[PDB]
Amino acid sequence: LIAVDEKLDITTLTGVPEEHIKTRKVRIFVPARNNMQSGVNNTKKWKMEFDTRERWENPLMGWSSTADPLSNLVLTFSTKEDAVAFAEKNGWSFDVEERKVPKPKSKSYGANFSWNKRTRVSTK
Amino acid sequence: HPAAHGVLRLVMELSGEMVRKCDPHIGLLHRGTEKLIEYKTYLQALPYFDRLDYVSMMCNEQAYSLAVEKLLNIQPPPRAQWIRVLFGEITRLLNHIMAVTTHALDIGAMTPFFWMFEEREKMFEFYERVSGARMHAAYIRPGGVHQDLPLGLLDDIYEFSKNFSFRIDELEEMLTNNRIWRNRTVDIGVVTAEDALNYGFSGVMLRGSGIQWDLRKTQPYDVYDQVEFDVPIGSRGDCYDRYLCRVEEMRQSLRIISQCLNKMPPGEIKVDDAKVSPPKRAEMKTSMESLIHHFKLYTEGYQVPPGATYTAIEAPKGEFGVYLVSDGSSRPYRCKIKAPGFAHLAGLDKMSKGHMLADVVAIIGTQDIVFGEVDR
Amino acid sequence: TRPTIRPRNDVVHKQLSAFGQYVAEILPKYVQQVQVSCFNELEIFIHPDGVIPVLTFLRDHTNAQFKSLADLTAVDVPTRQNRFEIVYNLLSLRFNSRIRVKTYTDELTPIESSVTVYKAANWYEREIWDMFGVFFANHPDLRRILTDYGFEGHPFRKDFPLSGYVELRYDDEVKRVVAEPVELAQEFRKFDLNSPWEAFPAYRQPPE
Amino acid sequence: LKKTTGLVGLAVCETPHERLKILYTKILDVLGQIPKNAAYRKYTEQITNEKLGMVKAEPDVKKLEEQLQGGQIEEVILQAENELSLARKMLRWKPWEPLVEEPPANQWKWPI
Amino acid sequence: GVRTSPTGEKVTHTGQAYDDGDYRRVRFSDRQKEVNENFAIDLIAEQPVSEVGSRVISCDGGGGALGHPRVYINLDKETKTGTCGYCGLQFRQPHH
Amino acid sequence: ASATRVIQLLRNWASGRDLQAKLQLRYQEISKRTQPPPKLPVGPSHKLSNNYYCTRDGRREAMPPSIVMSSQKTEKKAVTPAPPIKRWELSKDQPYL
Amino acid sequence: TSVKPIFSRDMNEAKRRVRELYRAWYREVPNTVHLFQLDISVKQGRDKVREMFMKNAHVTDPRVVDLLVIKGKMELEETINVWKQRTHIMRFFHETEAPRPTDFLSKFYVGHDP
Amino acid sequence: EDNKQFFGRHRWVIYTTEMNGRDTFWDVDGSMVPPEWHRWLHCMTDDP
Amino acid sequence: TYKFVNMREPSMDMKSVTDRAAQTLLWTELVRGLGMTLSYLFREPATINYPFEKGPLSPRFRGEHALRRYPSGEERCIACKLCEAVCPAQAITIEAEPRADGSRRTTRYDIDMTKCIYCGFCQEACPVDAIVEGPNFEFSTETHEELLYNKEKLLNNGDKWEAEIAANIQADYLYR
Amino acid sequence: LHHALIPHGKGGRSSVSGIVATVFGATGFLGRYVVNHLGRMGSQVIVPYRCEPYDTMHLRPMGDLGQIIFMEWNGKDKDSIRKVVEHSNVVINLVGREWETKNFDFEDVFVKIPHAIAQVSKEAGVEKLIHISHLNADIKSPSRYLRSKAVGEKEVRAAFPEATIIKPSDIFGREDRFLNYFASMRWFGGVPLISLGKETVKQPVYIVDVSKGIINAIKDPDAKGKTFAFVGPNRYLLFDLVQYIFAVAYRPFLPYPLPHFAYRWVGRLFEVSPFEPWTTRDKVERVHMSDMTLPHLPGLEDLGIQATPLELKAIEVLRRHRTYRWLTSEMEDVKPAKTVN
């Protein structure tokens, strides 16, 4: 076994083009809960995604064109540290967003019928 | 090249016409099927399995369906299983006709190609009647089969199966005892049993080498434990013995087809679980639960419990396997496809040792490689 | 009865568990874990440098005659330190059984080639190298098998785009096929399908 | 006595009992060089003594193949040779030692 | 009910018509523009309004399992007809 | 089929079989292209009672694999992955071709 | 830490392997130009070999250098065996790609790319 | 129609010599058949 | 059970040896193969007289696509995008908006017939039987652009093929 | 700008360059190169053709779906000219022939057709016109070809005052006449040269440089009403140039003098061909004529193009003319010819 003290760097081995290594900033984040639903199962894992590039309209058929290979590329990580290590070894720039969790709340059904407080509801 | 099946680049070193080495170059039909399957859902990835070995299509579909059902922990109904076995044997007949006649065409005979391809045309008519597609049916699905048989299909399959042994007999009249065919095929591409096992051969390769192994008998799936058939075993381990094994497998497939026709049961054809298999159109247009489940199944799909499985079946070309990895989502995390012809083509160089150019053509034919499944 | 539920085989489950304990006892140096999935599949997780000893044992031992290599593949999990997971599927004809052996590695760590144990490992490891970038140490002929000549990158890695980076066309000025950066007339439309509600409680992870 | 084994490249052995006795004795001799507490040694010694006792008690070849349940006597001889080679390699590898190294914290966690 | 743009180009049922200065009209030169003549909006307006003497009616589009999912329409608002929104069919209660 | 008696005899003699018994061209022996309407069955879960999905839920009975042994965590007889495969019996229908 | 060495235990052995591969690639350019019937000069081929070697000059990991020389050897053997075609050899030169602007003002005029 | 012929050859069409505005005396397509006779000719039904 | 495909040994009686010697010197099996080919020569060919004769097809056949209408003439498609979701090949492009009468109707409905794999999932997933895969299979073109259908082309296909499409759906809708 | 003419993309096959160009004479040498460059950058190209559509098939792969459009036109038909230039903002004129057929003369192909194209384009509202002339376009030239070029250049300038008139010297490429005309003379024994080719100086230009300059003239906003001269870097005597051509082709070069009247008679003999003639009297005159020097006119450097020397691209054209003995010889195996600079 040999001892080498370097930061891991595999950009020369991944085969990505230089522009797509150097001009790309990924976003490491936990997805925000879709406000149209009350489920919280899509807010468990961290995601890594790239910055949006240009999309234009095809002259024929009017479809949506692109020239960005990394437009649909989304990676799933279990931890912020794992995502950051992956981004660092692949050489991309990255912006990390701290996870937002709902704060604990005090819910009381009996509060709907307060004798002197404004929490008394006018209808059920 | 006519004998290269279209997308094989065989870089050969020849001393005169003697082959010094075979260096197969594949990837000329590599598409990225596994990456695409990662991007699709479980229903959307089924035609990919239709198009891998495009001669045993319902067989590839059946392997994929068995894998997904194993991970889902469900069970197809008996009528669905019997339809699956019947069409797997029909598909085996299609594949063996193709293999034997294309092998003979590479050797130099063409009339058996034409006769047995008329038979292939009739079996294509059966495929088109059940599915609407002549070859890429997408009929066998996780949970059973897509639709039920029309009301004359069993009678027509009976007529075909009744008249097919004579076609096999006529094919054998031109090749089996022909001295030119025997000179071309006898003691060509001999492979020992230990070498076959180490190189990873499966199916008629092993059985020509003399190994008594068949997945339909040893590790049965669907209703293969309720049918009677024999497993042909070769002795010399060469092209002639593998040809005999394939012809006798055609006859045993006729046996299994007769038993399936007689033992076809009544009932539904897909699992009665609307969270996995779609409801009927009338129920969808009448029931709220059925409409919801139709919507969700055809937009998102069903979630498969996390886990990895390797399921193999005895496809006409050998053991065809799927290693499927699910992460609990509606899209497969990983899907490795193990094609029988990959290992056989890997072993082509050893088999063609000490032979000539025409012998190498014969050895390619006896290995019976489809590069759709070799490359994926 | 339960017509729509797959029946289980506790006898085979017990046999596989017993053999897993057997192997784990015989090879303490390398075997890290043994599992039996509930559809009766035995899985042995070993240290990456016990590949040759464990495979040779599973091939040559009298009570484990796994003479056939059904498959050899890898799985890419970017969230792990050792992202690549090498999977060996073995078949025992003598005992009519199948086993799985799992190993881990990363980009820069080689795995010993098993062509000295199974001959199918040759093309299987060539494909693993070509598609994932895993290097196999003592391989007779390690080169690309499926990708185009001069293709850069390993397409089966999770961080590789689906359509790649370059595409081919014929250029009349130079009278040859050329490679130019990829550019799609209609971009692949990425669908978000996952439901925000939990499907299987039995696999629920601790909140941590 | 039999014309063929039915397997390509596997030849009929004229003296199966003597060859099996030689191979099993050699296997047991190689196993004596392995540590006594090794789980490998106890198991394969047990099965070798079990097989060696049958070859010394049944002089009929068909009955011996029936008792061994190893297929054919040539397959049994080939498997004995494979076991001997494995015993030598295991003596070289020494797999009875404690675990080389534990995996990272979450190396087998799934799904993830 | 097809209509013609000021440039002579037919207007589709979605209102599509290339501008006068749009270069993309060159593709139709020495060729034609594919336009379907029947307009579904016009045909469904031509359909008459059915009158039924119940507060709630059901429409499946006709044909049963060959139509659309069966839906129920509430005919209580007297200032408008209840429209089946799968097939665009109008229903009403007998007034006066 | 439509053939002269001479031609049929010559065909039979040349091939050594009775071709008229097994013909490869289909003459009115196949099913009609128009069939009566079907009425397919429903299935086992189409009852109005005693039919709760939790009692017939295959996917929810899937479990994570059982950990037989983990490093992290008498004379035993040696075992095998399964009982040895039985020797195959030669076919009674036609043992040899 | 104590990582497994693939081929080289130190950066000097990796440099030695790089030099050997450079000699091999340098001595094969005349044969490649002759066999593939390329219209480029031998000097152009050697300049391309140097340029391809020199874009990895920032690497300081012996394992990455070992992998780079392994891949270079593989693509040298693809050229020698004429497995590659003239298409790939000329793909090394990008003779059909338009000159991409590199200054801020030109990029600003062309479009939205950074 | 001729039911005495084998299946596939028991129904056939003689194309017109002038369809729409094309002189179809020699150049005859398989797409000249209107859909109802298309169904009858391809044998999706037994009723003309 | 199993059987041996080649495990028989020839009889060594003088009659059998002479018969084999005659077969070697007088090419008996070769003449037998000649007889088989001659028998096929005097059989009837299996060739149909295309394009005047067509091969058999079924109501389930999947050919060219079509967008259907209700008997009133109203389009069946309600722009629900289930076909776009289920399409394996991503060959359908759909864009919708409220119509002038407030209907949920499509403004764009494209199918790339060079991307379509003719699998029939779109007509399984359609809840209103709008998109169907009709019986037409002879629609080869001379340019690539002619194979990129749009809403006008698909509605024209439905109007042209509606009779046969209706008949096939009537014949096969009880199996669905 | 119209919203559909705004550039979008990265200048690739599936991008939008905002160029709608009608390329007359695209079914030829310079035409195929110009169409390739336009479609490569991702433009809309209209190809008017009078030939059999089979001869336009090599232009089909040059652009993405719908970007190449083929329309049938007649040279003497202003209605067809309007039909093809109606929707385009660039019109490129590459129509010309090196011989006179029964129906079209040098006056027809070089004066009448260019004037009609320029006049119809101005009526139709076409923003840019590019017109290809010849470098030696002299009204007093011995060659009827070049006299027609001069007259047509004047007519085009009058009809479309905002034109870009480009004057290439002698384009050489794979499908050219120049190098193939000189290299195909090996069949007729020796090489006949007027004054032994010692009184002729030529600087040929490369086809890719010509097409790149044509493309850059479209994109240049300050080349609207201008005249350019497209010439190569090096001037050669005709004897040295032909000797180098034969050296690169590895053919035995046996030049002999031929008097001008005899060469004219030979050229008259070859122009009775109903098909494409091998050589003509005007071709002989143009070959003998030295290339003019026009230092006042702008050039490839002014359009941003570095002219490619003949010594770098001659082996592309002349390797086809080698024998099997010499096919594999490399580019640097032949010493460059002496230049006259």
Ligand SMILES: CCCCCCCCCCCCCCCCCC(=O)OC[C@H](COP(=O)([O-])OCC[N+](C)(C)C)OC(=O)CCCCCCCCCCCCCCCCC
């Ligand atoms: C060599 C054989 C001699 C015996 C011949 C016996 C009769 C042969 C009968 C079969 C004819 C085969 C040809 C069929 C096609 C008909 C068209 C055809 O032939 O076209 C030919 C060529 C056709 O040219 P092409 O090469 O463009 O033709 C290609 C074919 N097309 C275009 C038809 C598709 O026609 C001509 O050359 C005629 C035009 C006038 C040419 C004047 C040439 C002058 C003489 C040549 C030498 C001059 C230098 C001498 C130097 C020394 C002087 C002292």
Ligand SMILES: CCCCCCCC/C=C\CCCCCCCC(=O)O[C@H](COC(=O)CCCCCCC/C=C/CCCCCCCC)COP(=O)(O)OCCN
């Ligand atoms: C009174 C005393 C008279 C003395 C004379 C006695 C002679 C009569 C008896 C002997 C005659 C023997 C016949 C001679 C021909 C035999 C040729 C032969 O050698 O047979 C075959 C060789 O022949 C062939 O194999 C033929 C292959 C090609 C066949 C393809 C076409 C043949 C089919 C068409 C039939 C031909 C009909 C001929 C008609 C002629 C009309 C003019 C043996 O080769 P193998 O089986 O491979 O084994 C040898 C080593 N173990």
Ligand SMILES: NC(=O)C1=CN([C@@H]2O[C@H](COP(=O)(O)OP(=O)(O)OC[C@H]3O[C@@H](n4cnc5c(N)ncnc54)[C@H](OP(=O)(O)O)[C@@H]3O)[C@@H](O)[C@H]2O)C=CC1
């Ligand atoms: N290449 C050179 O050496 C030089 C050329 N030029 C000029 O550049 C232009 C292009 O040159 P080049 O590529 O070599 O020429 P080509 O002969 O190869 O191509 C000429 C083009 O014009 C078309 N054409 C010719 N006559 C007519 C006509 N009467 N009506 C309609 N179309 C016609 C031809 O079409 P079709 O095949 O359908 O008949 C073809 O597309 C010409 O104007 C030429 O004079 C200037 C300097 C040097």
Ligand SMILES: CN(C)C(=N)NC(=N)N
């Ligand atoms: C090209 N394909 C599919 C073949 N089967 N080819 C062949 N030569 N047998």
Ligand code: SF4
């Ligand atoms: S048939 Fe299949 S591939 Fe074609 S449009 Fe329908 S769903 Fe998509």
Ligand code: SF4
């Ligand atoms: S599934 Fe049917 S109704 Fe829904 S968008 Fe598609 S064609 Fe329209």
Ligand SMILES: [Zn+2]
């Ligand atoms: Zn309705």
